[PDB]
């Protein structure tokens, strides 16, 4: 029962009990004890799932605050808007730290120490995810340089995915799904989004490792495509 086996196990207790912030701290201590050695497949997923649930709740709250704000601004009730603007500012500064916490961990050790192609596309995609989450709320010059880092990290992940990983590889299908989503809402290009996610979907159908894991993304890819292609408006 080493200290590394202690924190990997204690992360599953915070994961099972929805104590995700502490689950991040446990996996953070797992990473900040390694030189040029990378995390195992489970430890890799653990940390990423831990940060996923954390940033997911913060994002949900931000979308809700932005929506209520844009209604009060649509009404013109200014004394309420100034309060929602201040409240959203607090949420956005947390998101800065949450993305800073993983990006400065991806940039420091996870990406350089990635040896296999599976870990390269993994940690590269992760960078794009949290840089894309910054582009959701950041405005002005920060948004431009955020989507720059989102597009740059997603592209390098695609080079490694298209030459080393198989089309049905989860790490590759998930990369392409996030890639298409980045095109649709952040760059507002449906054809750049659809052509990337149609290309990646059909190469998984043509080629077809248990695919229950992959087909979960294949159902989320086709769902995205189909609803986009529909002429109706969100």
């Amino acid at each position: 029962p080493t200290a590394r086996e202690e924190n990997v196990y204690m992360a599953k207790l915070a994961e099972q009990a929805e104590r995700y912030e502490e689950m991040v701290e446990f996996m953070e201590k797992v990473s900040n004890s390694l030189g040029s050695e990378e995390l195992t497949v489970e430890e890799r997923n653990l940390l990423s799932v831990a940060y996923k649930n954390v940033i997911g709740a913060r994002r949900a709250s931000w979308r809700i605050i932005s929506s209520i704000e844009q209604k009060e601004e649509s009404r013109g009730n200014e004394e309420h808007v100034n309060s929602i603007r201040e409240y959203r500012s607090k949420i956005e500064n947390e998101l800065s730290k949450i993305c800073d916490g993983i990006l400065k961990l991806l940039d420091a050790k996870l990406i350089p120490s990635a040896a296999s192609g599976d870990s390269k596309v993994f940690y590269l995609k992760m960078k794009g995810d949290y840089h894309r989450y910054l582009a959701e709320f950041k405005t002005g010059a920060e948004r431009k340089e955020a989507a720059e880092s989102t597009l740059t990290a997603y592209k390098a992940a695609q080079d490694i995915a298209t030459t080393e990983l198989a089309p049905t590889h989860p790490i590759r299908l998930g990369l392409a799904l996030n890639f298409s989503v980045f095109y649709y809402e952040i760059l507002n290009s449906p054809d750049r989004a659809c052509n990337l996610a149609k290309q990646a979907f059909d190469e998984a159908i043509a080629e077809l490792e248990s695919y229950k894991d992959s087909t979960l993304i294949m159902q989320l890819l086709r769902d995205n495509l189909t609803l986009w292609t529909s002429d109706m408006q969100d």
Binding site: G174, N178, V181, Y184, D223
Partner: peptide, 5 residues
């Protein structure tokens, strides 16, 4: 808020 992973 389209599907993502």
């Amino acid at each position: 808020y389209f599907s993502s992973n």
